[PDB]
Paper text:
Affilin proteins, artificial binding proteins based on the ubiquitin scaffold, have been generated by directed protein evolution to yield de-novo variants that bind the extra-domain B (EDB) of oncofetal fibronectin, an established marker of tumor neovasculature. The structure of ubiquitin (Ub), a 76 amino acid signalling protein conserved among all eukaryotes, features a single five-stranded β-sheet enclosing a short α-helix. The crystal structures of two EDB-specific Affilin variants reveal a striking structural plasticity of the ubiquitin scaffold, characterised by β-strand slippage, leading to different negative register shifts of the β5 strands. This process recruits amino acid residues from β5 towards the N-terminus to an adjacent loop region and subsequent residues into β5, respectively, remodeling the binding interface and leading to target specificity and affinity.
The crystal structure of the Af2:7B8 complex with a resolution of 2.3 Å shows the modular architecture of the Affilin, which comprises an N-terminal Ub-like domain (Ub-N) and a C-terminal Ub-like domain (Ub-C) tethered together by a two-amino acid linker. Ub-N and Ub-C display the typical β-grasp fold of ubiquitin and bind the target 7B8 in an elongated conformation. The asymmetric unit of the crystal structure contains three Af2:7B8 complexes related by a 31 non-crystallographic symmetry-axis. The three complexes demonstrate that Af2 interacts solely with the target domains EDB and Fn8, with no direct involvement of Fn7 in binding. The two Ub-like domains of Af2 form a total binding interface of 1179 Å2, with the major contribution from Ub-C (811 Å2) compared to Ub-N (368 Å2). Target recognition by Af2 is based on three sub-interfaces (I-III). Interface I between Ub-N and EDB includes evolved residues from the α2β5 loop and strand β1, but also native (non-evolved) amino acids from β1 and β5 of Af2, which interact with EDB residues located in β-strands C/C’ and loop regions BC/C’E. Interface II is formed between Ub-C and EDB, including evolved residues from the α2β5 loop and the non-evolved R149 from β5 of Ub-C that interacts with EDB residues from β-strand C’ and the EF loop. Interface III involves interactions between Fn8 and Ub-C and does not comprise any evolved residues. The most striking observation was made by the discovery that the β5-strands of both Ub domains of target-bound Af2 have slipped from their original position in the β-sheet (as in the structure of Ub-wt18) by several residues towards the N-terminus.
Residue numbers in the entry:
A (entry chain L): 1 to 151
B (entry chain A): 1174 to 1447
Write the structure that this text describes.
């Protein structure tokens, strides 16, 4: 199957692999072609990071379709999202799609001192509920500029 | 020996075929035409040639690269001799979707629908959302060449969006096919006035469905002086407010608006005398 790896500058790296091939084998081929060390690479599929030691088949990737991945460097960090407060101050958070809503509220408390029980987080009109992850709402690396509303 | 006239170049993006056509030379007793197609990048060994009979006025070239300029030259041939050529340039394109439409539109999601293109060079499609006012990219994804449907979520109420689908080939892409979407914040309904004393009244309304708002905005004034308008901000989880310090025997006009951050719904208005 063909893989297409989209980078942050708009480049597309092409590979041809088997479904038994591991993620870390794909990073290895990106290293040879771009000089980016394997340990600096994060490969994102549908907004979610693929983990080493798994085959592509273990992610339920359909091998008759073209696989489209995003390359993000560890140096870029996690998702940078924005939270606007009761007053309208914008703050910056760095999260992962596997973070829970309470993890997210904990971070807001770390930066702003708002107890998590006082925090109501809304995403584009939908309240984000405790007990869920960002992923559950499909908040993941595909959202390039995400804004949450506080009250 | 006169060249041909009226050279036309047709690079069909849907089939990938370049059709070269011309008007036959006025010179008597020509023995054919020679057609060359060459990228104008100065790369040697990439030139393509066709030769056709004197009664032929077209030729084709397959597998040209999108985004690369080619020069096409047509020579009138008469035995040993050739004319000065007629020439022109052309840059083939990647086909772009033609029937992209919005479907299955809900308060919290919009569906993108299109017919997948029938070319084997297509490797997939890129879907982008951009807030049109500030030009901020909001969302990006990539899908396989067989996919003809996508669900876009996360559009802020009140914001205008450019939503584009881009056809991808190996080493190329089309111009974006773009739609715009803006979903207004829905108003409250069913405005009612109770507990009406001489200087006070209770205002109640029904909230809009299926949106978590930042707040409600209540505007109220005597009918005979709009310039005396007062305002209160109401919690988005509350559906009532008690107005106090009102003028007696005076009809007030009252409006309630839904608010999502900076954006308001159309106002819910009513009038009520104290």
């Amino acid at each position: 199957m063909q893989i297409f790896v989209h980078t942050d500058t708009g480049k597309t790296i092409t590979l041809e692999v088997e479904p038994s091939d591991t993620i870390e084998n794909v990073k290895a081929k990106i290293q040879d072609k771009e000089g980016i060390p394997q340990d600096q690479q994060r490969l994102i599929w549908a907004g979610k990071q693929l983990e080493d030691g798994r085959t592509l088949s273990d992610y339920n990737i359909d091998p008759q379709l073209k696989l489209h991945l995003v390359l993000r460097l560890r140096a870029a960090g996690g998702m940078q999202i924005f939270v606007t407060t009761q007053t309208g101050k914008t703050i910056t958070l760095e999260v992962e799609p596997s973070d829970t809503i309470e993890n997210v509220k904990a971070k807001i408390q770390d930066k702003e001192g708002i107890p998590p029980d006082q925090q109501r987080l809304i995403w584009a009109g939908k309240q984000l509920e405790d007990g869920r992850t960002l992923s559950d709402y499909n908040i993941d690396y595909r959202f390039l500029h995400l804004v949450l509303r506080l009250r | 020996l006169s060249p041909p006239t009226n050279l036309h170049l047709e690079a069909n993006p849907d089939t990938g075929v370049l059709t070269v056509s011309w008007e036959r030379s006025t010179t008597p007793d020509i023995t054919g035409y020679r057609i060359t197609t060459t990228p104008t990048n100065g790369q040697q060994g990439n030139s393509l040639e066709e030769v056709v009979h004197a009664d032929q006025s077209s030729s084709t070239f397959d597998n040209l690269s999108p985004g690369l300029e080619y020069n096409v030259s047509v020579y009138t041939v008469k035995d040993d001799k050739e004319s000065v050529p007629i020439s022109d340039t052309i840059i083939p394109e990647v086909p772009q979707l033609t029937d992209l439409s919005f479907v299955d539109i809900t308060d919290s999601s919009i569906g993108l629908r299109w017919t997948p293109l029938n070319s084997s060079t297509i490797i997939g499609y890129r879907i982008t959302v951009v807030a049109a006012g500030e030009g901020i990219p909001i969302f990006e994804d990539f899908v396989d060449s067989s996919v003809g449907y996508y669900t876009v979520t996360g559009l802020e109420p009140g914001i205008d969006y450019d939503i584009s689908v881009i056809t991808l080939i190996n080493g190329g892409e089309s111009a974006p096919t773009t739609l715009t979407q803006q979903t207004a914040v829905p108003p409250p309904t069913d405005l009612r006035f109770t507990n009406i004393g001489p200087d006070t009244m209770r205002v109640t309304w029904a909230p809009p469905p299926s949106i978590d708002l930042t707040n409600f905005l209540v505007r109220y004034s005597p009918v005979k002086n709009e310039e005396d308008v007062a305002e209160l901000s109401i919690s988005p989880s509350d559906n009532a407010v008690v107005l106090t310090n009102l003028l007696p025997g005076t009809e007030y006009v009252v409006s309630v608006s839904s608010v999502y951050e900076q954006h308001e719904s159309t106002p819910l208005r009513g009038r009520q005398k104290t």
